Design a protein around this ligand. Structure first.
Ligand SMILES: CC(C)(C)NC[C@@H](O)COc1ccc(NC(=O)NC2CCCCC2)cc1
Ligand SMILES: CC(C)(C)NC[C@@H](O)COc1ccc(NC(=O)NC2CCCCC2)cc1
Ligand SMILES: [Mg+2]
Ligand SMILES: [Mg+2]
Lengths: 319, 319
């Protein structure tokens, strides 16, 4: 599929708060489609979707999420809770004069677009998530308990202490992204042993091989982007679990009534497909896609299948 | 009418050439409408049209023309001929993924959108010009002769020598814009006596009064914008008369077949309405608007009337 050259894109900048601007690349004409990436990624993670969605007749706005790339990375940890992040994306639409837009997210971006649809459905024409399910908050057990119930999320505990995960992820940026951006059959890490091994990469190659999904040039773009603000901002998305839990509990009971799409990935061993099993009970108009042989990095693992699913769903339920 | 706060706008940047980027503000959703200002102005000259057109259901792209504001101001004089300027606006649409857009221009921007429609009609959905008529190039008499035939254009001769007009216009920026941005009944200068008086302002107040059209805050925005690159870039639009004449002659004979609108201003004593008298012979689908009591600075002189005319024409012939 056609990819993106960063130097030949239109770059937009919107100030949503005194010291917080958001950066995005923009391509195409038609209904506004806002793409929201995950951790630890970039607008560039949508490089295969941006020209395809624009050619299909949509105005693509691929964001650099707060803390990433050319977007502002404020220092405060609480600036990265879901309530603040969602309200700024509403201000983002306000400054652009957009009454609403289709929101498509992946990983942490998928969690954001779910709460945009949940708390601001009047501003979301349609919502789609890759890998990330929508599970209503349990007002009876803390996020500290729900993670201890699933050992796959032990890496999230290693991400909590500010400065610890930053030192490992920023020590060798090329090694960091070559070790993370891998197909499921090429994976070189276990999210189980992280807090027992003392880090994500300590039992991984220090000169890892290049995954079949990416080139050296694409890796170096991520390296150059994360030299701007580091990993603190991105990691702060994980450091508001209780805050996000209080906020999500304030919506309990209500359903998401707008058109929605859940795309599961067969080989995402963290955001597994069965975590989305009963989202239809909360999202009546939910449609589904499923990509076999697809790991966590859905957009670059199976870009063609992602483009097919999104364009088919956009043309039918979002137009 | 609702105006624009510069700090609350979405700002876009597109690189159209190695050392040349174009800056624009963007508001609204719908068909793309590209606004092109004149000399010596800014995207801010459309401040009353941008929210109105966006509310009417259009995606407004208000440019900072090359040499102005946050757009690049390359040093070469030939970089401001109409052929180069038009080709970059095509590249501008290319980078944004826009198959075409409605082009609306005023003054030198109106001259540009006419040649965009003339040479690139496949990229112009519809074209509208304020004050500036479309007169086909006479391949028999030079631009040096056509100006000597109309003494109103003597100021253009004063603008030819690089550095001379720059020194007068940049000496006191507040005085420059307060003296220029005036209603026709408040005018304080004669474009007739300029090359005989040795300048535009030499017979004008050195502490001129504030015109009823503008506030001190709006004047100071123009002052701050022109501190970036000065007046050379803007003045270079006038310094390619023969080059623009050769290029326009290469299209001789052909008509503009796309929807078009010519808006004349009753009190524009330079771009007088009768200069547009027989544009229908070259533009078969030309529609017209006329604003009484309106001087050269059409957008800020009669913003309400401009909004009414443009939205009515956009909804009927551009949608
Ligand atoms: C965890 C849970 C018990 C459900 N509660 C916490 C949840 O409320 C927080 O929401 C999240 C949503 C999505 C993600 N995605 C990732 O962690 N992807 C990683 C995959 C392996 C490589 C690095 C990135 C994380 C958190
Ligand atoms: C001049 C002609 C004989 C027709 N040939 C030259 C033409 O081909 C060049 O095209 C132009 C089109 C529009 C303008 N507008 C202005 O000069 N507006 C000024 C008004 C008074 C205050 C300062 C700005 C200038 C040149
Ligand atoms: Mg059920
Ligand atoms: Mg005739």
């Amino acid at each position: 599929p056609t990819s993106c050259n960063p130097s030949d894109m239109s770059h937009g900048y919107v100030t949503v708060k005194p010291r917080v601007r958001l950066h995005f690349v923009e391509l195409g004409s038609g209904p506004a489609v806002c793409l929201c990436h995950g951790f630890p990624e970039s607008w560039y993670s949508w490089r295969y979707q941006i020209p395809a969605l624009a050619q299909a007749g949509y105005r693509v706005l691929a964001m650099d999420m707060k803390g990433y790339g050319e977007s502002s990375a404020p220092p405060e940890i609480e600036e990265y809770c879901m309530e603040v992040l969602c309200k700024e994306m509403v201000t983002f639409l306000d400054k652009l004069g957009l009454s609403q837009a289709v929101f498509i997210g992946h990983d942490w971006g998928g969690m954001l677009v779910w709460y945009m649809a949940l708390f601001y459905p009047e501003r979301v024409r349609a919502v789609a998530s890759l890998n990330t399910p929508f599970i209503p908050a349990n007002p009876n057990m803390s996020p500290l308990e729900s993670i201890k119930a699933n050992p796959v999320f032990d890496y999230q505990l290693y991400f909590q202490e500010p400065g610890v995960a930053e030192a490992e992820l920023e020590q060798n940026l090329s090694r960091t992204f070559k070790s993370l951006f891998r197909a499921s059959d090429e994976s070189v890490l276990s999210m189980h042993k992280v807090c027992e091994a003392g880090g994500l990469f300590v039992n991984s190659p220090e000169e890892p091989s290049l995954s079949r999904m990416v080139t050296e040039e694409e890796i170096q773009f991520y390296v150059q982007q994360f030299k701007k603000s580091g990993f603190r901002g991105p990691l702060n998305w994980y450091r508001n679990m209780e805050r996000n839990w209080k906020w999500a509990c304030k919506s309990l009971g209500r359903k998401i009534l707008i058109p929605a799409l859940m795309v599961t990935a067969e080989k995402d061993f963290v955001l597994v497909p069965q975590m989305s099993q009963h989202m239809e009970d909360w999202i009546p108009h939910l449609k589904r896609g499923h990509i076999e042989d697809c790991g966590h990095w859905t957009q670059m693992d199976k870009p063609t299948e992602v483009n097919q699913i999104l364009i088919k769903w956009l043309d039918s339920d979002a137009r």
